[PDB]
């Protein structure tokens, strides 16, 4: 069954500035499109979703903004463990991980979760 | 006529073919020089010593064979 | 609709000065830093600072004006502020 | 065909079809120089830069453009800059002066 | 990101290790589907429609 | 203060040789190996030309090895694999080096063209290469012994010159050689020696090459550069990802051919270095250079040695050199042009209903389009949650989207775009009106401008996004603004054909209708008379109107009457508004009138009434139409009764002229040429026979016997009024259609007798193909002909912008009517109408001032003119304006779409020439390219010669081949005696007096000596006389402010006489020099100022010469302005439109102007 793998890196390069059509400067290279890049219709809805999430995360307690900012890496280098978190905090281990489910809760029940639902499709 | 293939082809021309007698002749002035710098090598004081620092540290397992010495004469 | 700008080429002569004046102006009541000077039809800002020129109370000059105006006015707010940064010394 | 924010090409960012929905229109010399002949020109910037060949005034332009502020940042068109690398690749040292 | 990892977390959505390839009805224009192919390399096993 | 160091907004740029410290500043890294990807892991191999260490991360924010795979980590080099972790976009930028084992050649400044290095050093390409090869040995630095410094020797010559002299004496091959040569190089003391040897000899031959090498050098030397950096040490690479290696579908790679070409020059110089530790014998370390410089020479430029092909493929590999260059010049701004954003396109159909302000645009192409905005003005009122749900809201076009699209749409501009762009009105801005159906609605007054047909063009939109763009689109391109032809003032917005068709029916009259004689109180009882059923729309009649003139002071006069008119007439009185009088109305309403009407009405009330009119015109014109039942059967073309009386009679001529012929009464050539005009006559009586019976046949009675006016037969009617089809088209329909010509350019002695109401025959219809097929090829190649010509054109003026005010020059140019021969050819009202007067005009008595001074003149003061008898009056024109780069708006004119006097920043250059090439497709020694000859400034083959010097002349010597021609003046030296061939026949009076400039012979005249001799005025006024025939010779109005902004460009250079500051000889702008004698006549030197002589270059040469490098790679050879302008170190500053759009800033006219302007200002000021 190596035959395809090997025939496969076996066979040489295509020469990009291979012409294709029209005999116009149109050649191979000017085909092959930017799968690397990022599309504008979404990066604005990146934008979008930090302003949804920072919306949301103003109508949790004050603890519980701090602690689920943590908790993941939002507007913060890394990401924090939740005993991470708990040293940081004081109160730690299971005290902290309650907090979570409520704050995870009250963006839960639709009030809040109205605004977010809309980014998964 | 520049196209280097051809301002080599005509740059070797030059240079005339061996007969057979001046193959060993080139052969055996090979063996002179080297044969110079071997015995000039061993007229070497420090030439000596350093051989010798070299296998002291290979009996101690400070080395291999392998990275000193390729054989001798046998 | 705003069919022809000529009423507008008029108050500044230029026509190109047209164009860049009343973009400046468009995006005063664009960007929400001020208001329509005059009826808005539903003509966006586009429109709306055009009919602000046709009717002669905003060109580069009054535009000028008020601007440097509004440097005064914030640079009377921040008074008490910048002054306390006599720490300088 | 009509376009708003397609997909772009490698080898230069610009506009082109690959979902088989179309490139966007191509804006030639003697088009350019109607917007040069009237007296356009934030169109023609405009056209050459954060609707082509930019690749962030595209992405700053776009999110503006929602946003409810019409504006451009222009920047610098990626094919210049690129003619920029292939001159200097070879001996030629060309560099952007002053300020 | 730090923004999409809290949306999943929120919806408990178990994000797939699959890509969306599928062909779909190219925009505006549509059909009737009078027909389907479906070739098969020799020697992987042929699916239920195929 | 402190300046900068970081970024800023740039000025300028620059452009050098790259010294070897330079190169390795931009590398990030020696490329060591060939290997490009791993083969398995299809990661980078590091040191490679695809590295990660080297250029950067193959993804964003990720190390390679994977140790730092977060976005937190950033500066952060990987302690394994060195990689800093960033986003993959700095693969595009980050370049690299190479350190080259033995020095090389760069192909770029050894080969073109003007060798470089060889006129650098004075030395021959074939010694230099000789070199280079190995195949000769050079001196360097000889000393005093046997031989010259740049001396070349052989092997046997080197060691017989070597066992001579050990020391003092110096000789190398290679490229060490000449890069010793081009080190040991003073270039001050060659000036020096250059400068004496420069005084002392004179000769042409001798001295030209002088100060061609001369201006290298103190150009080479003011540069900045060091000779040496022609030979490189260090080799830059280009960032992988402008090569990229990129994957493709089923597996296979796919990637440019540079990497092929990298590779060879990296293992090439890889085993050079090898080989020297190997010690290889000379032979080989020779060759592996050699192979070396050949593979370096492919990667820079590929073809100026032995074309390397690509590997495993034919076609050769495309080398760094032809990714810049192309076809023609630049592939990035050239045509075409760059792909852009928020556009669309589709088949476009009528859409009458349009005002003339707007378009219909799908509703699909409009969803699309606006999306972003949709998008933000729904989540903008809160109709979706987020941007993502409005996605999905449009997405699946829910019903309120609609709704939201029309409040994005209200004020929003559209630009509408047709497929040849020819002049400005190519693009012209709409405002979009929402339409069920995949077709773009078109305003028919438009169809005219762009040239768009219904029976199938396709247009494109474009959709103006930055605030800037929208007030430019609305104020600048939109349709309302521009209802004026550029090319000469008349509307181009003219009523079409089907609507001409209509307001002919409408004020026309026939002898005998309903309601005849009666009399109305208005124009709208003359309307419920004609609705209701009771009058016909054409009867004589008497009504009461109203009129106004405003010919009190701004002020609209009222006047009352009984006119004598028509039904219909009184009907279309209702459209005109008010200060036109109903005289305008009152005629039979023709295209040519209908157009006069709209021109008129714009000169009196303006552009809103002319706008609000002209859609009127229109609405009014297909409507009345549809009622009349205009129509085309085939008992409407009529053919005379009397025709086959005539090709009988013509018939006859022609075998009479046979029996001639067969008589030897007449000869051969004599007969045909006799045969042709007997039945050219023909033609000319069938036709004109079909036309008067055709024309007034209509024969009717009233209340009497008889009458007869113009026919009302549908056919006639068509071609009366202007809508279409024309008595030549008529005339084949009807009567006999003229005497084609067979291919090899005779005309057929057998016309064709028939026409097509009556059938072609087979011979008939094939004699035709030959007609047609040469027609439908002439347009189509002098259609692509027509364009070249608009490049050049835009080419030569582009830059040339209205700058200055008014530069104040009293200087201009006398305009008369054009009076060839006949009685004028062109008035003169329409050579001075909206220029501006060079001096105060005169009545016939004087101490009377007309018109004082520089004055626009617009209509009245040319019916002032025009009242008065003055038949001559003094212009400025564009050709002879003081201002330095620019024109001064009161040089120019007022020509505008818009009737005021050219604004300041409008750039001209592009609309002369756009407005020259535009109608350039209508044209047919002349022709076409008879216009290209002119601009081109081309010398005829056989020209006449002009008196060199005024004063009585003579002949003198003997026949040579020449027999010399000897001027002798009055007061001044005799010495001028031009050798003329005798054998040309000649004019000049042999003992007469003839002036300088007089005609010393026939035959056409250089513009070359018109210039000289006569002077500027005249040699501009003899490009627009003879290029303004051609064109209206085919009907085409171009005013001469076009055809005068394209010659000045044409004479923008001189060349000095004197000196003081420049060289001698030195070819140089007017511009330059202008300013450099001037400002030297007072300050400076009390005077030192150097005279020049103007020049006159054809457009295409005047062009070449661009001061601005970047523009001139654009259309010039690339690779010549870039070496030419790297050696000479020259500094682009932009300030041109060319450069500014290609490095992609606002252009430094219209808009932008004020931009450019603001900053350059700022610049050389504190
Ligand atoms: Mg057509
Ligand atoms: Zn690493
Ligand atoms: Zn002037």
Same mark, same amino acid.
């Given at each position: 069954?190596?035959?395809?793998?090997?025939?496969?890196?076996?066979?040489?390069?295509?020469?990009?500035?291979?012409?294709?059509?029209?005999?116009?400067?149109?050649?191979?290279?000017?085909?092959?499109?930017?799968?690397?890049?990022?599309?504008?219709?979404?990066?604005?809805?990146?934008?979008?979703?930090?302003?949804?999430?920072?919306?949301?995360?103003?109508?949790?307690?004050?603890?519980?903004?701090?602690?689920?900012?943590?908790?993941?890496?939002?507007?913060?280098?890394?990401?924090?463990?939740?005993?991470?978190?708990?040293?940081?905090?004081?109160?730690?281990?299971?005290?902290?991980?309650?907090?979570?489910?409520?704050?995870?809760?009250?963006?839960?029940?639709?009030?809040?979760?109205?605004?977010?639902?809309?980014?998964?499709? | 006529?520049?196209?280097?293939?051809?301002?080599?082809?005509?740059?070797?021309?030059?240079?005339?073919?061996?007969?057979?007698?001046?193959?060993?002749?080139?052969?055996?002035?090979?063996?002179?020089?080297?044969?110079?710098?071997?015995?000039?090598?061993?007229?070497?004081?420090?030439?000596?010593?350093?051989?010798?620092?070299?296998?002291?540290?290979?009996?101690?397992?400070?080395?291999?064979?392998?990275?000193?010495?390729?054989?001798?004469?046998? | 609709?705003?069919?022809?700008?000529?009423?507008?080429?008029?108050?500044?002569?230029?026509?190109?000065?047209?164009?860049?004046?009343?973009?400046?102006?468009?995006?005063?009541?664009?960007?929400?830093?001020?208001?329509?000077?005059?009826?808005?039809?539903?003509?966006?800002?586009?429109?709306?600072?055009?009919?602000?020129?046709?009717?002669?109370?905003?060109?580069?000059?009054?535009?000028?004006?008020?601007?440097?105006?509004?440097?005064?006015?914030?640079?009377?707010?921040?008074?008490?502020?910048?002054?306390?940064?006599?720490?300088?010394? | 065909?009509?376009?708003? =924010?397609?997909?772009?090409?490698? #080898?230069?960012?610009?506009?082109?079809?690959? $979902?088989?929905?179309?490139? &966007?229109?191509?804006?030639?010399?003697?088009?350019?120089?109607?917007?040069?002949?009237?007296?356009?020109?934030?169109?023609?910037?405009?056209?050459? =830069?954060?609707?082509?060949?930019? #690749?962030?005034?595209?992405?700053?332009?776009? $999110?503006?453009?929602?946003? &409810?502020?019409?504006?451009?940042?222009?920047?610098?068109?990626?094919?210049?800059?690129?003619?920029?690398?292939?001159?200097?690749?070879?001996?030629?040292?060309?560099?952007?002066?002053?300020? | 990101?730090?923004?999409?990892?809290?949306?999943?977390?929120?919806?408990?959505?178990?994000?797939?290790?699959?890509?969306?390839?599928?062909?779909?009805?190219?925009?505006?224009?549509?059909?009737?589907?009078?027909?389907?192919?479906?070739?098969?390399?020799?020697?992987?096993?042929?699916?239920?429609?195929? | 203060?402190?300046?900068?160091?970081?970024?800023?907004?740039?000025?300028?740029?620059?452009?050098?040789?790259?010294?070897?410290?330079?190169?390795?500043?931009?590398?990030?890294?020696?490329?060591?190996?060939?290997?490009?990807?791993?083969?398995?892991?299809?990661?980078?191999?590091?040191?490679?030309?695809?590295?990660?260490?080297?250029?950067?991360?193959?993804?964003?924010?990720?190390?390679?090895?994977?140790?730092?795979?977060?976005?937190?980590?950033?500066?952060?080099?990987?302690?394994?694999?060195?990689?800093?972790?960033?986003?993959?976009?700095?693969?595009?930028?980050?370049?690299?080096?190479?350190?080259?084992?033995?020095?090389?050649?760069?192909?770029?400044?050894?080969?073109?063209?003007?060798?470089?290095?060889?006129?650098?050093?004075?030395?021959?390409?074939?010694?230099?290469?000789?070199?280079?090869?190995?195949?000769?040995?050079?001196?360097?630095?000889?000393?005093?012994?046997?031989?010259?410094?740049?001396?070349?020797?052989?092997?046997?010559?080197?060691?017989?010159?070597?066992?001579?002299?050990?020391?003092?004496?110096?000789?190398?091959?290679?490229?060490?050689?000449?890069?010793?040569?081009?080190?040991?190089?003073?270039?001050?003391?060659?000036?020096?020696?250059?400068?004496?040897?420069?005084?002392?000899?004179?000769?042409?031959?001798?001295?030209?090459?002088?100060?061609?090498?001369?201006?290298?050098?103190?150009?080479?030397?003011?540069?900045?550069?060091?000779?040496?950096?022609?030979?490189?040490?260090?080799?830059?690479?280009?960032?992988?990802?402008?090569?990229?290696?990129?994957?493709?579908?089923?597996?296979?790679?796919?990637?440019?051919?540079?990497?092929?070409?990298?590779?060879?020059?990296?293992?090439?110089?890889?085993?050079?270095?090898?080989?020297?530790?190997?010690?290889?014998?000379?032979?080989?370390?020779?060759?592996?250079?050699?192979?070396?410089?050949?593979?370096?020479?492919?990667?820079?430029?590929?073809?100026?040695?032995?074309?390397?092909?690509?590997?495993?493929?034919?076609?050769?590999?495309?080398?760094?050199?032809?990714?810049?260059?192309?076809?023609?010049?630049?592939?990035?701004?050239?045509?075409?042009?760059?792909?852009?954003?928020?556009?669309?396109?589709?088949?476009?159909?009528?859409?009458?209903?349009?005002?003339?302000?707007?378009?219909?645009?799908?509703?699909?192409?409009?969803?699309?389009?606006?999306?972003?905005?949709?998008?933000?003005?729904?989540?903008?009122?809160?109709?979706?949650?987020?941007?993502?749900?409005?996605?999905?809201?449009?997405?699946?076009?829910?019903?309120?989207?609609?709704?939201?699209?029309?409040?994005?749409?209200?004020?929003?501009?559209?630009?509408?775009?047709?497929?040849?762009?020819?002049?400005?009105?190519?693009?012209?801005?709409?405002?979009?009106?929402?339409?069920?159906?995949?077709?773009?609605?078109?305003?028919?007054?438009?169809?005219?401008?762009?040239?768009?047909?219904?029976?199938?063009?396709?247009?494109?939109?474009?959709?103006?996004?930055?605030?800037?763009?929208?007030?430019?689109?609305?104020?600048?391109?939109?349709?309302?603004?521009?209802?004026?032809?550029?090319?000469?003032?008349?509307?181009?917005?003219?009523?079409?054909?089907?609507?001409?068709?209509?307001?002919?029916?409408?004020?026309?009259?026939?002898?005998?209708?309903?309601?005849?004689?009666?009399?109305?109180?208005?124009?709208?009882?003359?309307?419920?008379?004609?609705?209701?059923?009771?009058?016909?729309?054409?009867?004589?009649?008497?009504?009461?109107?109203?009129?106004?003139?405003?010919?009190?002071?701004?002020?609209?006069?009222?006047?009352?009457?009984?006119?004598?008119?028509?039904?219909?007439?009184?009907?279309?009185?209702?459209?005109?508004?008010?200060?036109?009088?109903?005289?305008?109305?009152?005629?039979?309403?023709?295209?040519?009138?209908?157009?006069?009407?709209?021109?008129?009405?714009?000169?009196?009330?303006?552009?809103?009434?002319?706008?609000?009119?002209?859609?009127?015109?229109?609405?009014?014109?297909?409507?009345?139409?549809?009622?009349?039942?205009?129509?085309?059967?085939?008992?409407?073309?009529?053919?005379?009764?009397?025709?086959?009386?005539?090709?009988?009679?013509?018939?006859?001529?022609?075998?009479?002229?046979?029996?001639?012929?067969?008589?030897?009464?007449?000869?051969?050539?004599?007969?045909?040429?006799?045969?042709?005009?007997?039945?050219?006559?023909?033609?000319?009586?069938?036709?004109?026979?079909?036309?008067?019976?055709?024309?007034?046949?209509?024969?009717?009675?009233?209340?009497?016997?008889?009458?007869?006016?113009?026919?009302?037969?549908?056919?006639?009617?068509?071609?009366?009024?202007?809508?279409?089809?024309?008595?030549?088209?008529?005339?084949?329909?009807?009567?006999?259609?003229?005497?084609?010509?067979?291919?090899?350019?005779?005309?057929?002695?057998?016309?064709?007798?028939?026409?097509?109401?009556?059938?072609?025959?087979?011979?008939?219809?094939?004699?035709?193909?030959?007609?047609?097929?040469?027609?439908?090829?002439?347009?189509?190649?002098?259609?692509?002909?027509?364009?070249?010509?608009?490049?050049?054109?835009?080419?030569?003026?582009?830059?040339?912008?209205?700058?200055?005010?008014?530069?104040?020059?009293?200087?201009?140019?006398?305009?008369?009517?054009?009076?060839?021969?006949?009685?004028?050819?062109?008035?003169?009202?329409?050579?001075?109408?909206?220029?501006?007067?060079?001096?105060?005009?005169?009545?016939?008595?004087?101490?009377?001032?007309?018109?004082?001074?520089?004055?626009?003149?617009?209509?009245?003061?040319?019916?002032?003119?025009?009242?008065?008898?003055?038949?001559?009056?003094?212009?400025?024109?564009?050709?002879?304006?003081?201002?330095?780069?620019?024109?001064?708006?009161?040089?120019?004119?007022?020509?505008?779409?818009?009737?005021?006097?050219?604004?300041?920043?409008?750039?001209?250059?592009?609309?002369?020439?756009?407005?020259?090439?535009?109608?350039?497709?209508?044209?047919?020694?002349?022709?076409?390219?008879?216009?290209?000859?002119?601009?081109?400034?081309?010398?005829?083959?056989?020209?006449?010669?002009?008196?060199?010097?005024?004063?009585?002349?003579?002949?003198?010597?003997?026949?040579?081949?020449?027999?010399?021609?000897?001027?002798?003046?009055?007061?001044?030296?005799?010495?001028?005696?031009?050798?003329?061939?005798?054998?040309?026949?000649?004019?000049?009076?042999?003992?007469?007096?003839?002036?300088?400039?007089?005609?010393?012979?026939?035959?056409?005249?250089?513009?070359?000596?018109?210039?000289?001799?006569?002077?500027?005025?005249?040699?501009?006024?003899?490009?627009?006389?003879?290029?303004?025939?051609?064109?209206?010779?085919?009907?085409?109005?171009?005013?001469?402010?076009?055809?005068?902004?394209?010659?000045?460009?044409?004479?923008?250079?001189?060349?000095?006489?004197?000196?003081?500051?420049?060289?001698?000889?030195?070819?140089?702008?007017?511009?330059?020099?202008?300013?450099?004698?001037?400002?030297?006549?007072?300050?400076?030197?009390?005077?030192?100022?150097?005279?020049?002589?103007?020049?006159?270059?054809?457009?295409?040469?005047?062009?070449?010469?661009?001061?601005?490098?970047?523009?001139?790679?654009?259309?010039?050879?690339?690779?010549?302005?870039?070496?030419?302008?790297?050696?000479?170190?020259?500094?682009?500053?932009?300030?041109?439109?060319?450069?500014?759009?290609?490095?992609?800033?606002?252009?430094?006219?219209?808009?932008?102007?004020?931009?450019?302007?603001?900053?350059?200002?700022?610049?050389?000021?504190?």
């Amino acid at each position: 069954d190596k035959i395809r793998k090997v025939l496969k890196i076996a066979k040489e390069p295509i020469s990009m500035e291979t012409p294709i059509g029209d005999d116009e400067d149109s050649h191979l290279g000017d085909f092959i499109e930017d799968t690397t890049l990022e599309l504008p219709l979404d990066s604005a809805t990146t934008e979008s979703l930090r302003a949804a999430t920072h919306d949301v995360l103003a109508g949790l307690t004050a603890r519980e903004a701090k602690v689920l900012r943590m908790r993941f890496g939002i507007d913060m280098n890394t990401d924090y463990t939740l005993e991470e978190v708990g040293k940081q905090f004081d109160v730690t281990r299971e005290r902290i991980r309650q907090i979570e489910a409520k704050a995870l809760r009250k963006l839960r029940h639709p009030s809040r979760s109205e605004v977010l639902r809309s980014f998964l499709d | 006529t520049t196209d280097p293939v051809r301002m080599y082809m005509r740059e070797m021309g030059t240079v005339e073919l061996l007969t057979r007698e001046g193959e060993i002749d080139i052969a055996k002035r090979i063996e002179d020089g080297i044969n110079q710098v071997q015995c000039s090598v061993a007229e070497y004081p420090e030439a000596i010593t350093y051989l010798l620092e070299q296998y002291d540290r290979v009996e101690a397992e400070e080395a291999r064979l392998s990275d000193l010495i390729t054989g001798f004469v046998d | 609709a705003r069919v022809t700008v000529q009423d507008a080429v008029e108050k500044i002569g230029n026509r190109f000065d047209l164009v860049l004046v009343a973009a400046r102006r468009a995006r005063q009541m664009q960007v929400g830093g001020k208001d329509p000077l005059v009826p808005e039809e539903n003509d966006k800002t586009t429109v709306i600072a055009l009919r602000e020129i046709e009717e002669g109370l905003i060109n580069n000059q009054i535009l000028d004006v008020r601007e440097r105006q509004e440097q005064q006015e914030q640079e009377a707010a921040e008074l008490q502020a910048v002054t306390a940064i006599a720490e300088g010394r | 065909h009509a376009r708003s =924010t397609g997909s772009y090409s490698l #080898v230069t960012q610009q506009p082109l079809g690959g $979902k088989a929905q179309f490139g &966007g229109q191509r804006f030639g010399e003697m088009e350019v120089w109607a917007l040069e002949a009237y007296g356009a020109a934030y169109t023609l910037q405009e056209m050459l =830069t954060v609707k082509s060949d930019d #690749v962030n005034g595209r992405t700053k332009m776009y $999110k503006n453009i929602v946003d &409810g502020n019409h504006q451009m940042e222009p920047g610098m068109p990626e094919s210049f800059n690129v003619l920029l690398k292939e001159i200097r690749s070879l001996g030629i040292n060309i560099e952007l002066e002053d300020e | 990101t730090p923004e999409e990892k809290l949306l999943r977390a929120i919806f408990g959505e178990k994000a797939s290790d699959v890509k969306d390839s599928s062909l779909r009805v190219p925009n505006g224009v549509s059909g009737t589907v009078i027909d389907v192919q479906v070739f098969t390399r020799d020697g992987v096993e042929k699916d239920k429609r195929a | 203060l402190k300046a900068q160091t970081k970024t800023e907004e740039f000025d300028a740029i620059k452009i050098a040789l790259a010294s070897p410290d330079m190169i390795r500043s931009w590398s990030f890294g020696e490329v060591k190996k060939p290997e490009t990807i791993n083969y398995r892991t299809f990661k980078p191999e590091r040191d490679g030309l695809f590295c990660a260490r080297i250029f950067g991360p193959v993804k964003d924010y990720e190390c390679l090895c994977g140790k730092y795979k977060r976005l937190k980590h950033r500066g952060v080099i990987c302690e394994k694999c060195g990689v800093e972790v960033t986003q993959t976009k700095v693969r595009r930028e980050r370049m690299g080096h190479i350190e080259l084992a033995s020095p090389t050649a760069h192909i770029w400044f050894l080969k073109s063209l003007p060798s470089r290095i060889g006129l650098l050093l004075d030395m021959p390409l074939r010694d230099i290469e000789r070199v280079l090869y190995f195949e000769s040995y050079v001196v360097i630095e000889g000393g005093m012994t046997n031989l010259e410094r740049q001396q070349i020797l052989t092997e046997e010559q080197y060691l017989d010159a070597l066992e001579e002299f050990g020391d003092e004496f110096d000789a190398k091959m290679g490229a060490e050689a000449i890069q010793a040569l081009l080190k040991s190089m003073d270039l001050e003391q060659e000036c020096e020696q250059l400068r004496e040897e420069l005084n002392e000899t004179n000769s042409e031959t001798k001295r030209k090459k002088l100060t061609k090498r001369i201006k290298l050098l103190e150009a080479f030397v003011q540069s900045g550069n060091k000779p040496e950096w022609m030979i490189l040490t260090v080799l830059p690479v280009l960032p992988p990802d402008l090569r990229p290696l990129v994957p493709l579908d089923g597996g296979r790679f796919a990637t440019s051919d540079l990497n092929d070409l990298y590779r060879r020059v990296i293992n090439r110089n890889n085993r050079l270095k090898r080989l020297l530790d190997l010690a290889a014998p000379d032979i080989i370390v020779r060759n592996e250079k050699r192979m070396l410089q050949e593979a370096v020479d492919a990667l820079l430029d590929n073809g100026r040695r032995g074309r390397a092909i690509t590997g495993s493929n034919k076609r050769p590999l495309k080398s760094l050199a032809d990714m810049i260059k192309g076809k023609q010049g630049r592939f990035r701004q050239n045509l075409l042009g760059k792909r852009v954003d928020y556009s669309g396109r589709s088949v476009i159909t009528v859409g009458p209903y349009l005002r003339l302000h707007q378009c219909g645009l799908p509703k699909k192409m409009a969803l699309e389009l606006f999306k972003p905005f949709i998008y933000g003005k729904l989540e903008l009122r809160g109709l979706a949650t987020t941007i993502k749900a409005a996605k999905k809201m449009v997405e699946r076009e829910e019903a309120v989207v609609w709704d939201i699209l029309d409040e994005v749409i209200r004020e929003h501009p559209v630009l509408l775009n047709r497929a040849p762009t020819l002049h400005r009105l190519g693009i012209q801005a709409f405002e979009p009106v929402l339409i069920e159906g995949k077709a773009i609605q078109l305003h028919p007054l438009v169809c005219a401008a762009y040239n768009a047909d219904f029976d199938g063009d396709q247009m494109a939109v474009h959709v103006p996004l930055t605030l800037e763009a929208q007030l430019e689109a609305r104020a600048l391109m939109m349709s309302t603004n521009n209802i004026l032809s550029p090319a000469n003032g008349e509307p181009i917005i003219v009523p079409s054909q089907d609507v001409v068709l209509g307001l002919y029916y409408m004020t026309r009259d026939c002898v005998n209708a309903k309601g005849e004689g009666m009399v109305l109180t208005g124009p709208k009882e003359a309307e419920r008379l004609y609705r209701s059923g009771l009058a016909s729309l054409h009867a004589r009649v008497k009504v009461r109107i109203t009129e106004y003139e405003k010919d009190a002071n701004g002020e609209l006069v009222a006047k009352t009457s009984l006119k004598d008119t028509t039904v219909g007439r009184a009907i279309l009185w209702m459209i005109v508004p008010k200060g036109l009088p109903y005289s305008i109305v009152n005629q039979a309403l023709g295209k040519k009138a209908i157009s006069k009407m709209l021109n008129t009405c714009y000169r009196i009330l303006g552009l809103k009434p002319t706008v609000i009119f002209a859609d009127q015109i229109m609405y009014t014109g297909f409507a009345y139409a549809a009622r009349s039942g205009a129509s085309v059967g085939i008992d409407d073309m009529v053919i005379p009764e009397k025709k086959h009386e005539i090709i009988s009679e013509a018939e006859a001529e022609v075998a009479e002229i046979q029996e001639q012929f067969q008589s030897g009464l007449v000869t051969a050539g004599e007969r045909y040429n006799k045969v042709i005009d007997i039945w050219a006559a023909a033609n000319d009586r069938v036709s004109k026979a079909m036309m008067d019976n055709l024309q007034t046949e209509t024969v009717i009675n009233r209340d009497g016997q008889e009458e007869k006016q113009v026919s009302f037969n549908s056919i006639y009617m068509m071609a009366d009024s202007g809508a279409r089809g024309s008595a030549a088209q008529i005339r084949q329909l009807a009567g006999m259609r003229g005497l084609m010509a067979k291919p090899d350019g005779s005309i057929i002695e057998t016309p064709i007798t028939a026409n097509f109401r009556e059938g072609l025959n087979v011979l008939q219809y094939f004699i035709s193909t030959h007609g047609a097929r040469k027609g439908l090829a002439d347009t189509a190649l002098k259609t692509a002909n027509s364009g070249y010509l608009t490049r050049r054109l835009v080419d030569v003026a582009q830059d040339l912008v209205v700058t200055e005010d008014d530069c104040g020059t009293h200087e201009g140019i006398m305009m008369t009517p054009v009076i060839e021969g006949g009685d004028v050819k062109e008035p003169l009202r329409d050579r001075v109408l909206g220029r501006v007067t060079a001096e105060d005009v005169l009545k016939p008595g004087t101490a009377d001032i007309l018109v004082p001074r520089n004055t626009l003149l617009h209509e009245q003061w040319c019916d002032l003119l025009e009242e008065n008898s003055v038949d001559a009056v003094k212009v400025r024109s564009v050709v002879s304006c003081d201002t330095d780069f620019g024109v001064c708006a009161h040089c120019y004119g007022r020509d505008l779409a818009r009737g005021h006097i050219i604004n300041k920043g409008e750039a001209i250059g592009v609309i002369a020439a756009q407005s020259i090439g535009e109608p350039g497709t209508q044209l047919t020694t002349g022709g076409l390219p008879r216009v290209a000859d002119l601009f081109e400034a081309r010398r005829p083959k056989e020209p006449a010669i002009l008196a060199e010097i005024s004063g009585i002349v003579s002949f003198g010597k003997e026949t040579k081949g020449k027999r010399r021609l000897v001027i002798t003046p009055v007061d001044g030296s005799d010495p001028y005696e031009e050798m003329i061939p005798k054998w040309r026949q000649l004019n000049v009076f042999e003992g007469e007096r003839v002036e300088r400039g007089d005609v010393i012979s026939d035959g056409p005249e250089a513009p070359h000596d018109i210039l000289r001799l006569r002077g500027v005025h005249a040699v501009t006024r003899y490009i627009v006389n003879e290029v303004q025939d051609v064109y209206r010779l085919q009907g085409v109005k171009i005013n001469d402010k076009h055809i005068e902004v394209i010659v000045r460009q044409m004479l923008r250079k001189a060349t000095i006489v004197n000196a003081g500051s420049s060289d001698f000889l030195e070819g140089e702008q007017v511009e330059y020099s202008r300013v450099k004698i001037a400002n030297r006549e007072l300050e400076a030197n009390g005077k030192v100022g150097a005279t020049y002589s103007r020049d006159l270059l054809g457009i295409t040469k005047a062009s070449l010469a661009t001061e601005s490098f970047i523009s001139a790679a654009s259309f010039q050879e690339t690779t010549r302005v870039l070496t030419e302008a790297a050696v000479a170190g020259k500094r682009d500053e932009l300030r041109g439109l060319k450069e500014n759009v290609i490095v992609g800033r606002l252009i430094p006219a219209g808009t932008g102007y004020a931009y450019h302007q603001d900053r350059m200002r700022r610049r050389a000021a504190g």
